Amino acid sequence: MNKVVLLCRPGFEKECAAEITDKAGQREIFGFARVKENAGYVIYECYQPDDGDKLIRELPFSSLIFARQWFVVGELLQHLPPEDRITPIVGMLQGVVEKGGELRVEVADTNESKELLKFCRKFTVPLRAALRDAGVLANYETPKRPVVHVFFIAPGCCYTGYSYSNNNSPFYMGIPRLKFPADAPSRSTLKLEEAFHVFIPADEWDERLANGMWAVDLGACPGGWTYQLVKRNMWVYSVDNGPMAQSLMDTGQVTWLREDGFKFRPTRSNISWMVCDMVEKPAKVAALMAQWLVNGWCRETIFNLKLPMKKRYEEVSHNLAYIQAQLDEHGINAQIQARQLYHDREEVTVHVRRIWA
């Protein structure tokens, strides 16, 4: 199979297409990605017949910024007989994957597909039963086996395929479903919560987002991101000339430092986490993040970079390369990952973890 579908934010198809072409090419997995503006997905079509499976095995999904999710697919099923949409799907998947561990019947995240999304929910159980009967799905679900995807691009038109659960998004449509807590002081809180879900494996939260850790939130006012750190029972320095929500102060976990986030330097505590969601130019933010890493002021950081109006994949790649150049110059080893989260708009969220053994 030679096609790989990538789900993206509608309007970001050129970024997602350039990026997958670039990073697959770098691994000598050559192909082309046509763009349908505002479709909310891109198809990367490999020149070689079975390179689609190779690509979703060998390229780490975590290294893709503009893809919410991906999966390899066969040919487009275009005329699904309304009297039996199931048989052709089963037919297309039979002999392609067996004993899959989970089924996800998905759509692109656009306005036009909302009715189609409800169809997919209705279709899921009947399709699951048929795929289990055919041996395409295992009789018992399991996270270790491949995830089977059936992707409807319009009524009666879908692709079918799979992704590997150790190299994909674990979320339906690549969208973690979060509820805004009425007591948080800003909806920006959902970005950082989504970041924790997307970047830190759930079974590592208690160790890496740990009770008792010290964290610094730069440009914190009024406290959306601080709220998430407090929820993890961290002790937090919220740094801003603006005041923090009284509800956060009342927790007894937060010290408000009335300073500029760019000027603040930590002295005193062992800071594990720093986070930064600021309305500033991304080269400027990236420079401050690199300084925090190379000065050893944090072990991990999550921060947002604003995208410019044009050359958005390039700009954000250059910001990341700057941070990597700083790391390399100082001999610091770290893992960097970045993603246009669901709750991001014209920005990307980045996670950097120093490797200290």
UniProtKB/Swiss-Prot annotation:
One of its GO terms (biological process) is rRNA processing. It comes from the Bacteria. Its main location: cytoplasm. Keywords: Cytoplasm, Methyltransferase, rRNA processing, S-adenosyl-L-methionine, Transferase. Gene3D superfamilies: 3.30.2300.20, 3.30.70.2810, Vaccinia Virus protein VP39. GO terms for molecular function: rRNA (cytosine-2'-O-)-methyltransferase activity. This is Ribosomal RNA large subunit methyltransferase M. It comes from Escherichia coli (strain K12). The lineage of its organism: Bacteria, Pseudomonadati, Pseudomonadota, Gammaproteobacteria, Enterobacterales.
